[PDB]
Ligand binder design. Structure first.
Ligand code: HEM
Ligand code: RWZ
Ligand code: MG
Ligand code: MG
Length: 429
């Protein structure tokens, strides 16, 4: 093949993975989430065909309460419908499939696990900072950090080998959200370690002891509380100050509400875009013709290329809802109180919605992917920020090291919730 000698194998674009026998699919087993993407993708293809709504037991993880199982929605239309009907598909009490507990709610009782009106009143505290016009004004900050990170990949590695995750994909979004929050630079890596554990728990490379998970949670919560108290006394133009100054229903946020909001923002900002970027580099490595067509017309294709990277990566695998009333979908009766899981990873391969879903096409248009969710009340707050982080990251790679390519298959995060890559070795000429 053309390119650098140690580059990973390319793939034939458009090739569907073989569908997987349904007896080999166990969404309730961590072993299933360790299988490679080709098997996972073929398994969701089987479900879309043979069991588009199906029930599964909740995965067991140390210290978490699995509780009741869940109805898995694997078809695009059902995920879209559920997302747009929050009066039936509630975000309370939790948006992962395990049960919420009072101990967890101290740190994880943010607006993401609330319905309107309280959800929207909370979201309005920070929403202006995430609008397209306001995010556009921090292009210079995104450029400066991305440009320096790529330059540092070159300066730090005389052998021209680097880990894309630790050296670019992780640190770029980390800096941007942490600066928006008003966190001093010296603490950004501490924040990143905490969010890595929070949304890596169950992978032995991150953490498997529930006491470590709760220590991390308490530590980031205490960090948030201390920063908030500083900003209460002396305002800065940052989101932490916005949080401590706001009122909802005439009342300031409590310390639990502040901590939960801070944690939500840094976790979501740190554990999503990095995976879009890393899966995007993996895809360019497997499909060099797509790299070439983007590099030849970077600004023209960037809108569609960023969206296709998000559809392909589906960084957030699923979100959970809870029914407030009985409902029948696709011939399956589901009861008030039942858990419902929305498989964005599967919606984003649904042949009923996408022409040629197995083709990675950076010009894809239209591209109604559900990578940021199905739309409606909880539509990703960070979507404009994420799209800009992704575009800039690839533009800086294109400009400085255009032939950057993966040299090993990724080390995959063991997670049902996040489509994570822990490490991706790359090289460039
Ligand atoms: C490629 C990157 C990202 C992806 C794929 C992604 C995906 C998602 C998804 C699927 C949801 C749930 C939507 C729903 O329930 O309908 C969500 C919500 C959210 N995301 Fe993003 N996200 C990304 C980046 C970001 C960034 C960079 C931030 C910045 C802090 C962020 C902040 C949030 C927040 C706060 C919510 C909850 C919104 C609410 O409850 O109203 N996300 N995201
Ligand atoms: C990814 C976006 C868009 C928002 C982040 C939303 C947010 C802060 C979830 C915090 N959840 C705390 C419990 N989460 C952990 C447990 C349950 C799941 C499996 C294991 C154990 C790892 C985590 C997920
Ligand atoms: Mg190295
Ligand atoms: Mg600052």
């Amino acid at each position: 093949h053309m390119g650098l000698n140690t580059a990973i194998a390319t793939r034939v674009n458009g090739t569907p993975p073989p569908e997987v026998p349904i007896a080999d699919i166990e969404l309730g087993s961590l072993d299933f989430w360790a299988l490679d993407d080709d098997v996972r993708d073929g398994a969701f293809a089987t479900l879309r065909r043979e069991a588009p709504i199906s029930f599964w037991p909740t995965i067991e993880l140390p210290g978490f309460v699995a509780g009741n199982g869940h109805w898995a929605l694997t078809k695009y239309d059902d995920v879209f419908y559920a997302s747009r009907h929050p009066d039936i598909f509630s975000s309370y009490p939790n948006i992962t499939i395990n049960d919420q507990t009072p101990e967890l709610a101290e740190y994880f009782g943010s607006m993401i696990v609330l319905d309107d009106p309280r959800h929207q009143r909370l979201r309005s505290i920070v929403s202006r900072a995430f609008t397209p016009k306001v995010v556009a004004r921090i292009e210079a900050a995104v450029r400066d950090r991305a440009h320096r990170l790529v330059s540092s990949m070159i300066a730090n590695n005389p052998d021209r080998q680097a880990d894309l995750v630790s050296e670019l994909a992780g640190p770029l979004p980390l800096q941007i959200i942490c600066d928006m929050m008003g966190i001093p630079k010296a603490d950004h890596q501490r924040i990143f370690h905490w969010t890595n554990v929070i949304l890596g728990f169950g992978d032995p490379d991150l953490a498997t002891d529930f006491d470590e998970f709760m220590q991390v949670s308490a530590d980031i919560g205490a960090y948030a509380t201390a920063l908030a108290e500083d900003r209460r006394v002396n305002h800065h133009d940052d989101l932490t100050s916005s949080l401590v100054e706001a009122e909802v229903d005439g009342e300031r946020l409590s310390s639990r509400e502040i901590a939960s909001f801070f944690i939500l923002l840094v976790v979501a900002g740190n554990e999503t875009t990095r995976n879009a970027i890393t899966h995007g580099v993996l895809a360019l490595s497997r499909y060099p013709e797509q790299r070439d067509r983007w590099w030849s017309d970077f600004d023209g294709l960037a809108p569609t290329a960023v969206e296709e990277i998000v559809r392909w990566a589906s960084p957030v695998v699923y979100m959970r809802r809870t029914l407030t009333q009985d409902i029948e979908l696709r011939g399956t009766k589901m009861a008030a109180g039942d858990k419902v899981s929305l498989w964005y990873c599967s919606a984003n391969r649904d042949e009923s919605k996408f022409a040629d879903p197995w083709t990675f096409d950076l010009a894809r248009n239209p591209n109604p992917h559900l990578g940021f969710g199905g739309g409606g009340a909880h539509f990703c707050l960070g979507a404009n920020l994420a799209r800009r982080e992704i575009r800039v990251a690839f533009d800086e790679l294109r400009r400085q090291m255009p032939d950057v390519v993966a040299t090993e298959e990724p080390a995959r995060l063991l997670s049902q919730f996040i489509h994570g890559i822990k490490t991706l070795p790359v090289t460039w000429s």
